[PDB]
Ligand binder design. Sequence first.
Ligand SMILES: O=c1cnn([C@@H]2O[C@H](COP(=O)(O)O)[C@@H](O)[C@H]2O)c(=O)[nH]1
Ligand SMILES: O=c1cnn([C@@H]2O[C@H](COP(=O)(O)O)[C@@H](O)[C@H]2O)c(=O)[nH]1
Lengths: 218, 219
Amino acid sequence: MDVMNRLILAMDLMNRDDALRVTGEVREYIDTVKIGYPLVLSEGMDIIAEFRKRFGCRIIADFKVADIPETNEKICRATFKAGADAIIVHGFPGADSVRACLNVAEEMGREVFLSTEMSHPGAEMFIQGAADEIARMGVDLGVKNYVGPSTRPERLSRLREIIGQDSFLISPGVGAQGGDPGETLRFADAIIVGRSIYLADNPAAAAAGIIESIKDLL
Amino acid sequence: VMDVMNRLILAMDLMNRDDALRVTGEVREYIDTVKIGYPLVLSEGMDIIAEFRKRFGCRIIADFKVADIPETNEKICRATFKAGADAIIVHGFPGADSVRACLNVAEEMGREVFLSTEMSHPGAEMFIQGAADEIARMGVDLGVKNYVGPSTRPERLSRLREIIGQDSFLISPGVGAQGGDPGETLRFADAIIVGRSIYLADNPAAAAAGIIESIKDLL
Ligand SMILES: O=c1cnn([C@@H]2O[C@H](COP(=O)(O)O)[C@@H](O)[C@H]2O)c(=O)[nH]1
Ligand SMILES: O=c1cnn([C@@H]2O[C@H](COP(=O)(O)O)[C@@H](O)[C@H]2O)c(=O)[nH]1
């Protein structure tokens, strides 16, 4: 995946008008948008096709897929039917649950991103201790796309080590959660940024500013 | 605790609105509590919750396996309760802050959180099983009252019941299609969740009636 400016917008506004307006305001800076349940549950799955129609951007569906294999398969089918290019899946529920998602993605020409270690404090309780193993599991399963934590660059670096330089790694927790864009891009291919852009008085200027700060990395 | 008719919750994971409504209507005399998940919601919209409420006298548990950071969890719970769900299922593996975010919204909005402890599928053995006793204990410490545990592992379901105590509410999927037994599961769970064994049956009503007949002495 080739992400413009190494910057993925996390569009977690919950109103269609605002989400479309803000995305439009930063469209010159990005070609990849992560849409999650805050927007989808508020406005419907049709929002994905609307983003494709208006912006042509890639859409990563951040659905943290975390069920049994049979249910995971159904979730992935519904998500790809709506036009998502990729889906984010949890590894904590185990290999069969991940494989179910990989199968549907292959069938529909899409990508699975595996969440390895989350960026919030609670991730320390259970996720962090399993994260290296979840990454190795991804490698064993042939997962090529991973998500790791901007808030812990030492952990992000370890995850990069496990998956290798050929795998694609994206990283949320930049800005609002405390992560630094440039430091994160030492290890991740792209950063995910939500609030620092979409809650800014001037989202375009916020996006521009982040990009300016990492210009030598582009 | 919610009073689940016949100790039986329908897992309505059909993905077509017409089929989901037909099957649910056919079993409505047996079941007053329906679990609606992402297979149906992502196919038909959050308004499917409204339609179920309108058509049937059923409580709705939104099985959304909520598993994000606190800020995102809060938004998911708000949208879900806004749409009319009585309760939402959340994961514990993302940790206490993530669970607390859901509890806070549920408290504010007058709804309920169910905490997934150990899942019933084979993959649950890899990471979830080893965390599950602590996830349950974390739930107790946080004041969680409602829990989900695995029909497929009676020994684990029994231990999780012990951890959460007899006063907590425990529901259990994995019955039927995944191998779990209704009666054995109800030794520990307040109610069983059944999906495919009912909704893929030639006669879903007869399937539900048969399950209920088999546990009649436990009602
Ligand atoms: O470990 C994490 C942390 N956050 N997110 C998601 O990335 C975005 C971070 O947004 P933010 O820049 O506003 O913090 C939100 O959509 C959040 O659910 C993840 O996928 N994984
Ligand atoms: O540990 C589990 C196992 N299954 N489920 C959910 O319960 C239902 C089980 O359906 P089934 O009777 O068709 O197996 C499905 O909706 C599945 O996502 C859980 O919530 N937790």
